[PDB]
Amino acid sequence: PAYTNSFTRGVYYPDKVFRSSVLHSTQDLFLPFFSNVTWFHAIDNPVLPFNDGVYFASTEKSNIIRGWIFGTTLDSKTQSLLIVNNATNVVIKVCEFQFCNDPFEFRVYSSANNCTFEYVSQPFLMKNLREFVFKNIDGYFKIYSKHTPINLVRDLPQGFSALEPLVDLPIGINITRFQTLLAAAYYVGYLQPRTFLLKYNENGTITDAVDCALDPL
Amino acid sequence: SETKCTLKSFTVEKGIYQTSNFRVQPTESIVRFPNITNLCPFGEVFNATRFASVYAWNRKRISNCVADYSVLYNSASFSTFKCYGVSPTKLNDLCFTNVYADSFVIRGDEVRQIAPGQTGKIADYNYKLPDDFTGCVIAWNSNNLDSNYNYLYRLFRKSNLKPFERDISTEIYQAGSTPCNGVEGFNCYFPLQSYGFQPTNGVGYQPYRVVVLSFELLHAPATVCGPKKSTNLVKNKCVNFNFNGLTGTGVLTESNKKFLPFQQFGRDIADTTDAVRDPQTLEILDITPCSFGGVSVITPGTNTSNQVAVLYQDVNCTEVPYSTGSNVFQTRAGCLIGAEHVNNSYECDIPIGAGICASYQTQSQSIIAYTMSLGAENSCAYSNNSIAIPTNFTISVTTEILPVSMTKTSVDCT
Amino acid sequence: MYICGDSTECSNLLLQYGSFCTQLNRALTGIAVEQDKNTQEVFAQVKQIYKTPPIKDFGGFNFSQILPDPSKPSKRSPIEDLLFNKVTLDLICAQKFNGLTVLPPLLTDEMIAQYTSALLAGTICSGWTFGAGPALQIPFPMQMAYRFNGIGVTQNVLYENQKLIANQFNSAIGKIQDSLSSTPSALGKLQDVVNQNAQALNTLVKQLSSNFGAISSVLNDILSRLDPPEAEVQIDRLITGRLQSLQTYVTQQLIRAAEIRASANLAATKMSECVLGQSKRVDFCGKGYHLMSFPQSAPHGVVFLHVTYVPAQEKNFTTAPAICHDGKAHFPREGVFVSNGTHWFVTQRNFYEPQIITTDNTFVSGNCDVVIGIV
Amino acid sequence: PPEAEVQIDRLITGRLQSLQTYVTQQLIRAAEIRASANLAATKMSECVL
Amino acid sequence: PPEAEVQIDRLITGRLQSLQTYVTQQLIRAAEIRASANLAATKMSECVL
Amino acid sequence: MYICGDSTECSNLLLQYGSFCTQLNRALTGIAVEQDKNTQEVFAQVKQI
Amino acid sequence: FGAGPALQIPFPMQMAYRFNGIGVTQNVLYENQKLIANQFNSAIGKIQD
């Protein structure tokens, strides 16, 4: 539905190493430049097939987007990752939950069971460009976040976004399907293993990059 | 004498010879390690009442704490304590992260754990361990202590075991073409076969309590690691720093960069360790290596005199540790020790560096260093309506030597 | 140090491989010595320093764009300043930390400029006479008249056209300076050498962070992780990799140094022939008939300003092999017979200076019945 | 025989590397000497004759 | 795989050595041919023209 | 293609040895460019046909 | 044409110029033009054989 182009947003820091005025090439999963991201609308929220990574821009101001569902089967057996994010607390749990149906309060199995991982973080999570990236690598969930001051561009804000990593909580699940925990819209951008060239600035921030898969130039 | 040994001869001709390399040596040693001192949960998966089954083991996530592997290693117990990628004696000094203790029980005969890539099918359907395994394997005898947690094992799963993957529910299995709609015996047999050896006395087959530790080495925040000590932090000194397990030698100095809050290790062009983060008090320190260069011996011929003048190639003036002749003098090609600077200029005798030359001057018989003279001044009086015509000649015969053919050598192979 | 810095175990393991390190050090030292020798043959031709004359009475020739300028602290001519500015190269600090060092050249750029100005203040004053024996002073217009006779053109062409030739000289030198300043690809040969050297040095350093089949690229990580029986194997693998990389770098440096030595020999020959003389070899010193050259210092190189005489403004004539006056064939002594349609003259071959055909401009040989095309 | 083969292979690799290095050095030196000899022949033909 | 890595590593080392030797010999031969081409260009310039 | 011809398992080990392939490719490319320059220098003296 | 612009000249006159260059006068070529041309043609024909 009204497929918007990805442009050149979705670049993060592959590892926690400070490099300055250098051109390093990494073989890491990045969102390909000038791709297509579905313009899913949520004023509703079907099961988005999480394959290998999700680009979650979802500009909004009403904070209707509370959290994110991330489950393998979403019924039983496997553990379900839930990242409910209130005004301040961003409490996360991996307890086995059926998740019931679309939320608006715990719309889950309400049975707990395998309530093992219960990290809460707490400080904060949030001109309100969410700019989230999710991926599972060798039993490690990594979330990359950044806020962009955009209040005039309806489509994707042409430019660059050096996504500083947010947290590196070690968990593990296949997460075949996922759905946003809900007047705005949320895009999804699938992740592929594309070699990238990254130009770290003199201050250590990735000012620009080129996708080494797009065109022969 | 060093120059004499370098040329493998007792006679040294006039010139400058490169002998040995200079290197500033460390004075102190820094073993800065994180603040954590509370002991790790060892014995929770070691001194436990029961362990898990091979089909469904337990993956305990050891977290931030001091892990004293020496207590486990030197204990007069266990067996087949084989550590892959690490040495048990050096297990304490290394500062790891993400050590995942796996506890479970197998049969007495195997005790293999798929160690390098072992093809044994006992654990080929139960528990596969990756080839690049930087951890340790420990096996314990359980005959005396309730030979009941042997439980069961996966007889077959018609599928290979992906490394470090756990399969729990295996009910449907078949070998014939008939679909397994709740039929086990006719098609073949149902999986998850049991093992009964809770008492008995069968030697060589008593259940073994096998626990493996899988450290994750290399660059990491290094949450859980060993019981080392902590030395103070000295700046602008050649030290043997050991930051969070990163061993090396260099001069740690207060930084100026803008290290991002999530970044730990600093690099630069060509990927060398330009910066580091201090584990106790988070601060960035640039690590430039201690200075070094090439020691050169400016010497006249030993037939003339037995005096020399050392030239350290790159050390400025103060990194200096013959060796000292009360004539230290800074050039553009490093510190020159043993020669006196003479303001007068002569033709170059022994080239040194960027314009500096050295020679043996009698008027005391000491080595002097000067700036080379290009040639004799011949200010020529140019003037119009004035030409100079020679009135005599001089037939001069010069010489010129040119090598033509080198020696013809043929070298056999076998 | 490059194979393994501050590591006694790897250093002891390196001694088993013979004297490879000694061979590499000897080759690199020989290359450095040869590089020191290269600039002592191009520039150090004459060991006598001639100061640039203070007064400027060279007959209209400017020369201010090639002689040293006593205004800036560096005694370099404006063209030399442009050449030095155009060729431009911390990267060196990071490389230096891996056992690499850059020995400074024996002759600084100031002494190279002094040597160049010595060759330039001798060519102006004496000409080619200071390259053979003692310097013999001669006025510059007469030196250029000597050089005009070197290409078959008589002395009258210069003296009667002294102002025009001086103006063309000054304009050509100004155009040369403007072309050097404007086009950024002029100094390509000197920049390619620096680029190749820097690229090779960068490739040498980047080979240190390679596993080469070992557990880790860092030797310290391997050393304080395993017992000596296995650390020996890992360090041996690393040693083999680093040794192969160093050998490849050294061989490439040797080949490049041989090429640079050939170029330096050609440059020294060009200096000796074009600068300290007037070469009759075609297309050696510039395109056209060579007159004289001026050397200029450049970063890791030399720039020659080849002054040449190029004819233009052709005129079409009718020529005869000889002229039969009366039963005798008169051939031109020096020159060629040329008629503009009705009257016959004898002119020079490189210029149009018609003259009456007398018995002084011609010499007799035989009768006028053997030459084909006689008139 | 197995460990002897392994060590003999190591020695073979070392000696082969040494021979290759000697051959390459000889080739470069021979190129230098050939350039010098070409210069000498040109000098002879253009100055003696 | 874990046992085939050794064999393919031996093959990689051998082929790398062969390619390096070929490249070095080609570089030396190219230098010689460049010298011959420079001589030919000089001969053309100073004799044909 | 020469060392590990159409094999991902071998091509993955070829990355362990650094950038040797890049150096060989660059050397051969430089040799070819030098051959082209030699051919241009010898014959293309006067640009008037 | 290799030292500026091309100036036409009859080939016998150019041969006379070259004879002057080698030292011999103009008379030797112009009075022996047929013999020199025949020798030149014979030499070129013998080169092919």
Ligand SMILES: *[C@@H]1O[C@H](CO)[C@@H](O[C@@H]2O[C@H](CO)[C@@H](O)[C@H](O)[C@H]2NC(C)=O)[C@H](O)[C@H]1NC(C)=O
């Ligand atoms: C619990 O594990 C610890 C590991 O150290 C064992 O404690 C050791 O016991 C031996 C005798 O068996 C003593 O010599 C050591 O000094 C003890 N070490 C420590 C640190 O206390 C203990 O045996 C285990 N308990 C069992 C096997 O029942």
Ligand SMILES: *[C@@H]1O[C@H](CO)[C@@H](O[C@@H]2O[C@H](CO)[C@@H](O)[C@H](O)[C@H]2NC(C)=O)[C@H](O)[C@H]1NC(C)=O
């Ligand atoms: C030689 O040429 C230079 C450069 O054109 C002349 O220097 C110029 O002199 C005029 C007159 O004084 C000044 O207005 C210009 O600014 C100068 N140009 C530069 C670039 O400095 C010089 O005068 C000429 N020499 C003689 C003897 O006339």
Ligand SMILES: *[C@@H]1O[C@H](CO)[C@@H](O[C@@H]2O[C@H](CO)[C@@H](O)[C@H](O)[C@H]2NC(C)=O)[C@H](O)[C@H]1NC(C)=O
């Ligand atoms: C030869 O060419 C020169 C220029 O190369 C001619 O000199 C020019 O003459 C014109 C007309 O008088 C002047 O406007 C120019 O300024 C002169 N140029 C220079 C550089 O001085 C010269 O006239 C030509 N001679 C003949 C005989 O044709």
Ligand SMILES: *[C@@H]1O[C@H](CO)[C@@H](O[C@@H]2O[C@H](CO)[C@@H](O)[C@H](O)[C@H]2NC(C)=O)[C@H](O)[C@H]1NC(C)=O
């Ligand atoms: C070109 O030829 C013409 C004749 O065609 C020559 O011009 C004559 O020269 C004579 C002798 O001085 C004069 O008396 C006549 O008045 C000239 N005639 C004309 C029409 O000008 C001329 O000398 C030749 N010039 C050159 C440069 O070869």
Ligand SMILES: *[C@@H]1O[C@H](CO)[C@@H](O[C@@H]2O[C@H](CO)[C@@H](O)[C@H](O)[C@H]2NC(C)=O)[C@H](O)[C@H]1NC(C)=O
């Ligand atoms: C130059 O003049 C002589 C006579 O002075 C010409 O010779 C004559 O040529 C004609 C035609 O071939 C003969 O018929 C006469 O017998 C010749 N006379 C003598 C005295 O030998 C000669 O041809 C003239 N040259 C040219 C080029 O016209």
Ligand SMILES: *[C@@H]1O[C@H](CO)[C@@H](O)[C@H](O)[C@H]1NC(C)=O
């Ligand atoms: C992959 O996801 C599927 C789909 O639910 C699940 O059955 C399976 O257990 C997952 N595998 C792993 C290794 O997580």
Ligand SMILES: *[C@@H]1O[C@H](CO)[C@@H](O)[C@H](O)[C@H]1NC(C)=O
């Ligand atoms: C880098 O940080 C410095 C801190 O002094 C700042 O002045 C500069 O503007 C920054 N550069 C960029 C490109 O943001």
Ligand SMILES: *[C@@H]1O[C@H](CO)[C@@H](O)[C@H](O)[C@H]1NC(C)=O
């Ligand atoms: C570690 O302890 C020191 C000494 O009290 C203290 O200054 C420092 O803040 C501590 N670090 C952390 C991360 O708590």
Ligand SMILES: *[C@@H]1O[C@H](CO)[C@@H](O)[C@H](O)[C@H]1NC(C)=O
């Ligand atoms: C080198 O030492 C001199 C004094 O001998 C001093 O002035 C200079 O600053 C020093 N330079 C460096 C880079 O340490």
Ligand SMILES: *[C@@H]1O[C@H](CO)[C@@H](O)[C@H](O)[C@H]1NC(C)=O
């Ligand atoms: C004669 O030479 C002139 C030089 O300007 C040229 O233009 C003309 O074409 C030539 N004539 C012939 C017939 O070749």
Ligand SMILES: *[C@@H]1O[C@H](CO)[C@@H](O)[C@H](O)[C@H]1NC(C)=O
């Ligand atoms: C030039 O060629 C013509 C035409 O063939 C011929 O008649 C004549 O003899 C030749 N020589 C001269 C000097 O005209």
